[PDB]
Design a protein around this ligand. Structure first.
Ligand SMILES: C[C@H](CCC(=O)NCCC[N+](C)(C)CCCS(=O)(=O)[O-])[C@H]1CC[C@H]2[C@@H]3[C@H](O)C[C@@H]4C[C@H](O)CC[C@]4(C)[C@H]3C[C@H](O)[C@]12C
Ligand SMILES: Nc1ncnc2c1ncn2[C@@H]1O[C@H](CSCC[C@H](N)C(=O)O)[C@@H](O)[C@H]1O
Ligand code: SF4
Ligand SMILES: [Cl-]
Ligand SMILES: [Cl-]
Ligand SMILES: [Cl-]
Ligand SMILES: [Cl-]
Ligand SMILES: [Cl-]
Length: 356
């Protein structure tokens, strides 16, 4: 028997970067990219993702204005402040007219996509949503829905009503952890919803939380490979942020740098995908969205939920500021985009196929 020394870390890190540049996405390559702690490696990774972003999605940062129109949810996800068992939250629902007129105001402020998001609130489903979608589509914009898991027939009605896109983060690709954290459902059902949405012709978004309790680097690699397998149009990634009124209150928060590396690797894997700089990133680090836009992201989602409801859509602590008026977000993100040397999207910003 003889010795088994490790290789030098800078040279190993350079080899990982070269494998990524050559698009050799083996599990060991992605695991080592996520495991390396050298911040020179990390900076090179971010620069590679930024390069790919520049080449395949360009300089536009697409602005999607989100209206979180109900915080009522029938599910009980262990991470989420809107879980039905959290009785320490005031619940609300917006009327259709409130929603449509708030959307119209976003459109007038220049938003080219309206995102409608809620808890899984049976009040609206399916027909109230359909009517809202039809009204917003008359305004000449894209409509994205983010309403959770519903039957195929609901997704079909919403597509016929004119919805363009659907966001359904897969959360975690580990089926064991998924059921533990989402006790109403399963990864299988989540995936089936995503497959149905794509079959119906939606642009679909998936994505995951980083730093969930029980989640390992190997699980993160599985997330990345899951995203790659499906070639998702959109990928939403953020850190897990513990909420005090949930069973995960005392768990570790997701790490910013690790989540940023997940964004960067997603851009490398999916060069022409639409990848937001999520509000969760801006929650855990001041300026976090701006940083993320330099590390492969190309979308931003200003909060357009109106007072007095916005403060009640408390997925995680720190999500909402009440210091400024509820119309400030769109001009604020436009100023951010200008300062980055970027520009807002010119059109609806649908995912294109320009890589390969
Ligand atoms: C606020 C400025 C000050 C220093 C800047 C960062 C550093 O430059 C390192 C790195 C360079 C990459 O290129 C893009 C990402 C990153 C993290 C920058 C992002 C952001 O712009 C920072 C945080
Ligand atoms: N504690 C937390 N930390 C970070 N993100 C969280 C979070 N709780 C919820 N989220 C994120 O918020 C997203 C939107 S929840 C609203 C839409 C729908 N009910 C759905 O579940 O898809 C979730 O996909 C999840 O990734
Ligand atoms: S993550 Fe979505 S489905 Fe789960 S409790 Fe929160 S709002 Fe409901
Ligand atoms: Cl020997
Ligand atoms: Cl969108
Ligand atoms: Cl998102
Ligand atoms: Cl988020
Ligand atoms: Cl915002």
């Amino acid at each position: 028997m003889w010795s088994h020394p490790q290789f030098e870390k800078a040279s190993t890190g350079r080899e990982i970067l070269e494998k990524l540049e050559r698009r050799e996405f083996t599990r060991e390559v992605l695991k080592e990219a996520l495991s390396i702690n050298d911040r020179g490696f990390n900076e090179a990774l971010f620069k590679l993702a930024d390069e790919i972003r520049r080449k395949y999605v360009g300089d536009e940062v697409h602005i999607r204005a989100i209206i979180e129109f109900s915080n009522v949810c029938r599910k009980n996800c262990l991470y989420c402040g809107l879980r039905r068992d959290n009785k320490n939250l005031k619940r609300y629902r917006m009327t259709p007219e409130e929603i449509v007129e708030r959307a119209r105001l976003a459109v007038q402020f220049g938003a080219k996509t309206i995102v409608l998001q809620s808890g899984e609130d049976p009040y609206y489903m399916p027909d109230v949503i359909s009517d809202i979608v039809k009204e917003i589509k008359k305004m000449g914009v894209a409509v994205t829905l983010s309403l959770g898991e519903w039957p195929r027939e609901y997704y079909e009605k919403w597509k016929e009503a004119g919805a363009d896109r659907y966001l359904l983060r897969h959360e975690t690709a580990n089926p064991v952890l998924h059921r533990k954290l989402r006790p109403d459902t399963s990864f299988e059902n989540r995936l089936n919803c995503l497959l149905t949405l794509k079959e119906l012709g939606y642009e679909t978004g998936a994505g995951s939380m980083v730093g969930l309790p029980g989640q390992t680097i190997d699980d993160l690699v599985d997330d990345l490979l899951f995203l790659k397998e499906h070639d998702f149009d959109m990928v939403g990634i953020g850190p897990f942020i513990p909420h005090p009124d949930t069973p995960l209150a005392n768990e570790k928060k997701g790490d910013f740098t690790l989540t940023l590396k997940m964004v960067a690797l997603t851009r490398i894997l999916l060069p022409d995908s639409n990848i937001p700089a999520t509000t969760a990133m801006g929650t855990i680090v001041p300026g976090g969205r701006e940083i993320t836009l330099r590390c492969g992201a190309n979308v931003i989602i200003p909060n357009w939920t109106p007072s007095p409801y916005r403060q009640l859509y408390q997925l995680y602590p720190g999500k909402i500021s009440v210091f400024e008026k509820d119309t400030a977000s769109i001009p604020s993100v436009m100023k951010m985009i200008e300062l980055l040397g970027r520009k807002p999207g010119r059109d609806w910003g649908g995912r294109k196929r320009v890589f390969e």
